[PDB]
Amino acid sequence: RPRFSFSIAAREGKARTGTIEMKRGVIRTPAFMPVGATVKALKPETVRATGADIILGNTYHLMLRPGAERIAKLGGLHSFMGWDRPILTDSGYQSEEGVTLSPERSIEIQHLLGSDIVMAFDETPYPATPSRAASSMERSMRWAKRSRDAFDSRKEQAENAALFGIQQGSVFENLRQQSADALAEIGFDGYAVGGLAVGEGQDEMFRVLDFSVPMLPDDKPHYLMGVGKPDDIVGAVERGIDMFDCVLPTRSGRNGQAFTWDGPINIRNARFSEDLKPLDSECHCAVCQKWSRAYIHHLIRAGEILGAMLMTEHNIAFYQQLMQKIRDSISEGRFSQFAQDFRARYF
Amino acid sequence: RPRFSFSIAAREGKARTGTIEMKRGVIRTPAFMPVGATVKALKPETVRATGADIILGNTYHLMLRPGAERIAKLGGLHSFMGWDRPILTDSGYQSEEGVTLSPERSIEIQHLLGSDIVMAFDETPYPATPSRAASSMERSMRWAKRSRDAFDSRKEQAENAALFGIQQGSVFENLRQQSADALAEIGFDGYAVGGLAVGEGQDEMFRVLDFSVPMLPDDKPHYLMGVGKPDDIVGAVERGIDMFDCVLPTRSGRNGQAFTWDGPINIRNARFSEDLKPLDSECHCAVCQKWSRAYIHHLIRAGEILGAMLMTEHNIAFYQQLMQKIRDSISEGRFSQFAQDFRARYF
Ligand SMILES: [Zn+2]
Ligand SMILES: [Zn+2]
């Protein structure tokens, strides 16, 4: 495989479906990346069986424990945790130099972990005034150039990994445009939309995506960081987003929240205590094949680890099934119909 | 298969190896029964993959949550938890009537759960005076007859399950003999040695097994309740024990203790932080195939659920491998050699 190739196979409006090819494997887009040096309560083989093509790791947590250098001594993150496919690492979400973490150190840590997709080191709270959002965006663009240069100066990294830049600008169209321009001038393998899902609400997030995603190079992947709920994902794909990561399915799962095509349910609710149905009626996951709502209700009420395991496997599988229906519906020119049907039933 | 058939295929001194056949499957003896309505941190398929033929469930915990009647409404324990092979249930470890639980209720609960091997309801703290141990043993034998009659009066249970009686008597040879006599006069499908592993220490436990196990019918299985460490198991098999249950491998596992052929290790110890070796050098389990001491050290230090999962899978697999080496060495007439070699290396 090449270091990085993104190809778009089908479109419908702003939505796209395709593939990213990398040395460690192929990523089907739109993609959901489960968040990890573990996807909580799941073996990597289980994560793969749900359909994930790539997972996310964190520069912040891993650098603290067990340490980036230690992981590199041990053979890198893939070998450490037993996941042999692509890994995307966030950059580590104050001075011009960095945070006491700088762009250079961030890129180095991601190298030491052996990340396949490296994120530029970026700085913007919500709400923000125009002045503050601009100051922050500009710093982020200076740090984006430092990230680019640090990555390129490390031959092994530049030859085997990819680098994504992150658009800032808060909710302001002019700053988003400046930011997109800056990032394209530097040039990256993909472009994230940063600075959303930080308290603005779906309506506002969608409004900003509406003008922001078209500013980015059309021929490169578009990653919406930290999103989100199933309906956030569907709307964001309608606006041109190709990649997602979020802790909801894992975290939610351990707290009793199961995703279903008829909306989320809280399995701890006494109404499930004698419910022999699977979590979701249509889900093809191993959990829905084998165990009832009643059993999983019991496990979660009892604080049993197997409850966390089963809830998490189901939720990540649900999310992968969602992404597959999105991909197929775009490939078949019926994604707008799918999005409408999905929302009518989910809500 | 028959309701219950125990056949001995080979012997060496007091040690025996063979099979129990039941409707839900065959049990290889000497057997280790992992303790559960879940074996903590493991899917039942994982439990089976380690080599377990039977697991234990509890009348006490299940009757409290989620309730015996609820589990029967839901189709019984096997269907509830997704384990289709035999399950042994303890009886629920004060008046002549029972505990505020009586023999009759205990047997009924085990029926409602759908237990394959039902334990008689029994009462003896350590240390105990001869007078108190005798009083307690005698009550237990009256309760053993009540258990027998309750089981036999329920046709479905008597036709499809087995009933084991439990020997008491503390550390006193004469009371153990009276107890064995009483139980044989009533007649059971198997015989447990109760009242050990309650604080007496290995030397004393072995001394009591030395005279107590020969008192029991030779042609029926002998179950040592709540034992134990790998060396306890080996010594107890040398004294005629066929069946074991213990929470050590599961509980220990979650606390960082891994069993190995060179003795237990605590994986949280900083010495393992960069150790790329598997938990045990010879172990054939999936955990030792795939992950390092270093990774598992990190997970347990970090309190990650996957740490508990992997430690537990390894430890239960270790125990099953131990039981297989015992079975094979008895079948080959070299168990005394095995026991000596095991101890020399383990210690
Ligand atoms: Zn499911
Ligand atoms: Zn192992």
Swiss-Prot record, chains A, B:
Protein task: Catalyzes the base-exchange of a guanine (G) residue with the queuine precursor 7-aminomethyl-7-deazaguanine (PreQ1) at position 34 (anticodon wobble position) in tRNAs with GU(N) anticodons (tRNA-Asp, -Asn, -His and -Tyr). Catalysis occurs through a double-displacement mechanism. The nucleophile active site attacks the C1' of nucleotide 34 to detach the guanine base from the RNA, forming a covalent enzyme-RNA intermediate. The proton acceptor active site deprotonates the incoming PreQ1, allowing a nucleophilic attack on the C1' of the ribose to form the product.
Listed Gene3D superfamilies: Queuine tRNA-ribosyltransferase-like (3.20.20.105)
Enzyme class: transferase
Natural source organism: Zymomonas mobilis subsp. mobilis (strain ATCC 31821 / ZM4 / CP4)
Source lineage: Bacteria, Pseudomonadati, Pseudomonadota, Alphaproteobacteria, Sphingomonadales
Annotated catalytic residues: 90, 245
Cofactor(s) needed for function: Zn(2+)
Known EC number: 2.4.2.29
Family membership: Belongs to the queuine tRNA-ribosyltransferase family.
Subunit structure: Homodimer. Within each dimer, one monomer is responsible for RNA recognition and catalysis, while the other monomer binds to the replacement base PreQ1.
Cellular component GO terms, alphabetical: cytosol
Cofactor note: Binds 1 zinc ion per subunit.
Annotated region (RNA binding), positions in chain: 226-232, 250-254
GO MF annotations in UniProt: metal ion binding; tRNA-guanosine(34) queuine transglycosylase activity
The protein's name: Queuine tRNA-ribosyltransferase
Binding site for Zn(2+): 283, 285, 288, 314
InterPro entries: ArchSynthase1/Queuine_TRR, TGT, TGT-like_sf, tRNA_ribo_trans-like
Pfam families registered for this protein in UniProt: TGT
Keyword Chaperone: no
Reactions the enzyme catalyzes: 7-aminomethyl-7-carbaguanine + guanosine(34) in tRNA = 7-aminomethyl-7-carbaguanosine(34) in tRNA + guanine
Key words, A-Z: Glycosyltransferase, Metal-binding, Queuosine biosynthesis, Transferase, tRNA processing, Zinc
Outcome after substituting residue 245 to N: Abolishes catalytic activity
